[PDB]
Point group: D3
């Protein structure tokens, strides 16, 4: 192979998501940083082994790709597509670079973020900064276990990493991000049985509701899709809660990785636009998307060589 | 008698500091919450034993004290006193309640803060909310180990908890908070040897500089105070870094507990106003205080009733 | 002076409860063992320090007391008082000796139990043996967090240990054990909101229900008692799940320590016989007591000197 | 093809559940087999990564024929009784095996509860054992147990069906026997005598040298080389269990191998002896009270049902 | 109390023992260091809390005490007394200062030792340096669990700390050190049953041999001594293995603390000189003492204020 | 082909043992080599999983010739002395290397004891070092040590012999050098000067930028690009050691590579210098007192003797 970035990371309990745009003239500064970001990851992380588990995944948007590089583009790379649904909208917001920084402790994330933004001062404009924290039993802001059906091992490699279909960019992946805010008051007004019907799984035990009872507009129903192959289409997610109690913000930061954006984009269409049997994903009646961006996360080797 | 709040907490790596003012008419909602805050601490924390190490310490300001209660006031409770130094200023900012929430993980802090603010929606106005994280070798935002000379065990009990000198309020303590922002660019322009001269200890090994070489305007020099009998006056600190990379905010949230505010206030006067030997604490040449408040943290029993 | 047993133990995640009767002629063998039980706890436990957290608490029943010792009896010691409620029955079952063994691992518990019983074979007859385990995040078999409102530190010392009121036995405590079996099918038939009404706290978050809403026949309602003093009366509980899936046994092993049995017995009367405003504790509609015994757990120095 | 979790990390707790399928139970069983992987995830995922919950499902010979039609695994037959001059290996009923392992008992128990909940009415329990690791991987006779198990690629090659039965590649054969030990007898031997029974040193777990290791020692009789001269290996995960009230001290034996021929050879040598050894001396202190053989299919085989 | 030094330490798995003599003219350097040793302990240790468990206990010998201080002497302070037995001899070797440094990791021990010896360069001459490590189940070099019968809690405070019998020096203790080397070949030639008869406990299970079978010349027999009341006289031990495989050195570094040396010295006389019943402690047939020193470890306050 | 445990997890304790084979000792050493894997398991198994005990056994050039029938690994020769204008890399005797690592020194010692137990009489100790990692991966000079080692596939490729010497695939080449430091001298430097010697920042471990990194910095000289254009990498596991009484503060260097050409190049650069650098400045505070090269065979090689 070539070495991929740390897309398949161990379970980590803290994250920083940084989205920036590249200012006029910024391209050179950015190119230098990209070639050093792996060694900054080691500088910050190595001394905190082995509990640290610090990783940084760097992604580049469609328009930024063309400013930074010439030659081939990854096959799937385009701007995030707005979805204007009957009721709900998936918005598009600007973002040229993504840093998805993960570790077992927030401070490690922050130390690496500090170093990266230190090198980019003057070249970039911050668009989003989120400090995420996992709840102690892998629960999210809605109180459900979040992560359970993610693929693992070889299945994950198959679902997430670009291969032979675009061989110049093998080891890469496509990341979609959306920042969601929740109406927790509304959510907390449902009974548990009602909430389970929205998600499609049991709250306490995390056992999937049987097909005979799981609503067609439940989240798990609409995000299960089968390919042309008859095989299930999979993504790798690492959703993180965030918020502020003083400003009444409670949020889920969605990030989904896939070997092609077509998979992630299909799931999004089903959620926002609905199907024959479902107006839309019921989870969107409690969750509003306020950002939306798409990035390509190259193989590690690609970045080293600049 | 009394169970104190969890003022002497184990080392914890995450904190939420929440400072609020009480709206007119809010007093009753607040009173109910104060009587329940211990049981919220257990509800959220008990199931995360024993790694969770969740605690909440609740403090009440001088003006709010008068709105909430009648009868005795704690002897030492007054508003934070501004210090207008020749060069540096310690400001005073509004705050009626303090929640000092600590645990081994941020999410536990957040869950408890959510519960508290949920019960207070409509009664209070948030003034400050800070999510702190300790760096992995007890270092602070300036890269120095932070906490080393805090008292422990019986020395800490003696330094922090109100006793027989104000017996109605035994088990209590006085908390001073200041939010500091640092000029990291300036700081990182000093050599390590220069930084050590600012703090008064060695950066990598955390060994105190010897008396013959420690500057008089170093931080450790100015915050060492001896009482009339010649014994050292101590406080208990739990400084936490915080920040945002995007907005270039790099901060230290200072919190100091003491059995009387006179100790904390003296150290502050020495830092801001100087001594014969020292114009001011050199650490203030890299650190600006943007909040300042004083609270009394009652014994736990006091709140139960 | 006196050093209590390890009644106030840290949280431990395994236990063995062993209840035996003394055969005729067994008294001398039991007396020798009682003087050695602390040294066996060291023999087994010391090598697994400090993770091990092995503790054995030894309790003696009312009629056993008279066969083993002459001199003073602890003031509160009598047989367990059977409760014959309108609906639900707290039975009293034989028990001369209790060994309440706790540790962070079952094998340490088992090792100690093996050594104790090895010395006592010939002289005792086992009546009950339960291997208990912690379930998830301090949850019991009904899926609720169990322990939350126990007292801690000074408050626990005062609620549990005999003092000046019985000075010959200061450092002692009274233990009540009852093995409960649950009807899981019935219980799972309830909505979560209905279950929360039975217990009197929220299931997921373990927040207590407000006075505004807490039923009077909720468990938390009936087991809250304020003394003549105006102060609450507290016990220390360390309930352990146990069971067998093949036999459909799902259980809670209740053990509660108190400085006098009057406290424990009142809570039991409220639960089984009811109050002015509540027939009986609704928890008993899904929980059957099949054992019941009371024991005195002497101070450690009492046992040493035999 | 993805195998089941036969090669598991070291785990300190286990539940072994053996059941028979009632008449008419076959359809309920087939549904459960297709869901058992997702129950494993539901129960286990929230305790990652310390949980290490795994369930291996095995199917007996007669049950295989009730549940499926067409080709059978080449090696699948009922456990063969061994009627030795002194010691006997009995065969007991069992159609399905759930070998559930984790770092904590409660994860095992939660998964067993879910499985048996789906099978209520279709199956009858024959055996349920809750096993625990004892100290430092010791068994109930006080010896370290596991030391010579194969690891990594050697283990993959010893336990997984391959080319020799390609329709069932990814599978394995599990033999289970529940043993009870006569501890009184055992503890009457000196340590040196016990070492001669096992074939290794008690405290250090170093193998006895070939010049002193008896031919009727356990390690001697269970070391078997093929005609090509290579060692024939199995993967074991013996677990202690017991009840102190009943004076029951046991070892639950489970051995996995790519063909039952390997496991069965070792068994014949233990029970029936060799030219130079009447039987395995360990059987003078260990009685088998169960005996069953199961085929543990590749994971994909179960998914597609 | 006055604050004692960390004589009662948790179980720690690494130690450095440093014994030095003070050169002529060294006295002042030494006095400065003694007043700073607690703050060096915090500097080195604080950043590794709470896994670190670094402690240093500082002791002063008889002749050094007179060079360093005027005022009272601790009542019990004298040079270690050589014991010239019929077969075995307890030697006395020079030592003015003892640093007993303990932590969960060797590097913390070493960092503190480096700081201390750095301040004393020029003033002192090293006599003994041992780096000790605990075997993984609290076993010593002879393969027995070592530490089992040590006192804990209040019993330990009573056994080790000076009180009202020498009130000027309350909070202090007396440390005896001896470095032993073992004849492992001889030892390994005994059966386990024979080794158990030497020590007086069971090897694998660490259960004491019963009084009716424990030999009078076993180690546990000769180091059990009762005071006038018939109460056991106890010390606190923290023996540490050490060794060098290339030089065939396998050793136990003995350190025992007591409130008066009379107790420790009694046990030593019994071991080396024997009694009416026992020629000498059989453990000495496999263990040779090559050092011997006695130190007083003052209360921490005493060192602060010089 | 199964390698030894060259690529180990991070371990915080080590023993390095170097011996020579006495005349006539060769049969004894051959026996031990065939058992050393089973001794690693005897001692380590019971301490799973925290123990992480591993033993890597290396054989020198002249020992190879005395011990083995046929072909030699391509790269095996005696360590070549380097006689630089200022600093000298000495070559010292050593036939056998045991590189023992674990999370705790007692496991290391136990295994070392057992090995030397079998070898007493047949070998002569030349060096024995008990190493321990500082609490944040620091070496005796106070710098983080290990940061740029390769990982995973990159490491597998830089360390393990492949098809270029197919009889010995799975093997590796180890160079050891024991270094003693002049701490007094080194502590005389400012932090900025020390950073110039190493080529990275002290506290943060960030590499100095190319326009500030000296050419005689350690990181500068031990960066080597092949004829390939690609970086040439070794795998290091340097361990501090020492004795405070004797004023010895040391770094035990061990580097593995798939050919010694890589390690030897870096050594020439350090000791003999380049176009723009007299020698590695680190050698101005570090004296090598040993030097040997060994071949560490595949595990399978040793098993079959
Ligand atoms: C708005 C906040 C979101 C929350 C709180 C959330 C939460 C959840 C939860 C609780 C599950 C069930 C457990 C699990 O398998 O992780 C789940 C499954 C999943 N979610 Fe989401 N989700 C969100 C948004 C999204 C989006 C935007 C997508 C796709 C673009 C997505 C894709 C999935 C997928 C594919 C599954 C698994 C389906 C399967 O079971 O086979 N999620 N999510
Ligand atoms: C089936 C047997 C039992 C189960 C499963 C059970 C479970 C629980 C649960 C879930 C709670 C709420 C959380 C907490 O521990 O504070 C609780 C509280 C309590 N239980 Fe029980 N319990 C049982 C039997 C008993 C018995 C037999 C007694 C007394 C004799 C008792 C006394 C208490 C007390 C005093 C409280 C706390 C009330 C307060 O909030 O002040 N329990 N129990
Ligand atoms: C009856 C209870 C059993 C006990 C307590 C027991 C115990 C042990 C112990 C202590 C060892 C040595 C350490 C090790 O390598 O794990 C061992 C090795 C072994 N046992 Fe058993 N065992 C039992 C039954 C069985 C059975 C029924 C079989 C095979 C059918 C078996 C096969 C093996 C094998 C293959 C080895 C490794 C031999 C080698 O060193 O190459 N065991 N057992
Ligand atoms: C080679 C030196 C030594 C070794 C290897 C050794 C080893 C042991 C062992 C294995 C035990 C039994 C377990 C325990 O309670 O710790 C023990 C007990 C004891 N040792 Fe030693 N020991 C040594 C030297 C000494 C010396 C020199 C003394 C006293 C001056 C001493 C005093 C004791 C005492 C007081 C006990 C406990 C007695 C009681 O059981 O009530 N030891 N030692
Ligand atoms: C006194 C002996 C030594 C000390 C104290 C020492 C210390 C260090 C330190 C602090 C680093 C920087 C952090 C890192 O990347 O690990 C480093 C890097 C390195 N050292 Fe050394 N080192 C020593 C000897 C050697 C020797 C003898 C070699 C080679 C023969 C060597 C090869 C390397 C290599 C290859 C690197 C990384 C180069 C890169 O940055 O790409 N070291 N060493």
């Amino acid at each position: 192979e070539p070495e991929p970035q740390m897309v398949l990371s161990p379970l980590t309990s803290a994250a920083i998501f940084l989205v920036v745009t590249i200012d006029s003239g910024g391209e050179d500064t950015v190119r230098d940083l990209l070639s050093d970001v792996a060694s900054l990851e080691r500088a910050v992380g190595f001394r905190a082994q082995p509990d640290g588990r610090l990783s940084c995944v760097t992604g580049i948007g469609s328009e930024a790709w063309d400013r930074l590089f010439s030659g081939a583009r990854p096959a799937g790379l385009h701007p995030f597509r707005e979805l204007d649904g009957p009721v709900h909208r998936a918005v598009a917001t600007p973002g040229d670079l993504l840093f998805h920084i993960r570790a077992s402790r927030l401070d490690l994330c922050f130390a690496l973020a500090t170093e990266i933004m230190g090198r980019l001062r003057g070249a970039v404009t911050p668009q989003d900064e989120v400090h995420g924290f996992k709840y102690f039993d892998e629960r999210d802001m809605l109180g459900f276990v979040d992560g359970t059906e993610n693929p693992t091992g070889a299945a994950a490699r198959r679902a997430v990493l670009v291969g032979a279909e675009d061989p110049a960019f093998a080891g890469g992946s496509y990341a979609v991000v959306q920042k969601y805010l929740h109406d927790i008051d509304a959510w907390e007004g449902l009974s548990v049985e009602a909430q389970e019907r929205v998600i499609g799984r049991r709250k306490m035990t995390d056992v999937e509701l049987s097909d005979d009872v799981k609503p067609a507009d439940s989240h798990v129903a609409l995000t299960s899709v089968t390919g042309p192959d008859g095989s299930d289409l999979e993504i790798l997610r690492d959703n993180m809660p965030f918020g502020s109690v003083g400003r009444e913000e409670f949020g889920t930061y969605f990030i989904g990785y896939a070997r092609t954006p077509e998979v992630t984009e299909t799931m999004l269409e089903r959620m926002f636009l609905g199907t024959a049997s479902a107006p839309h994903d019921r989870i969107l009646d409690f969750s509003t998307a306020v950002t939306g961006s798409l990035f390509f996360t190259p193989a590690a080797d690609f970045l080293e060589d600049l």
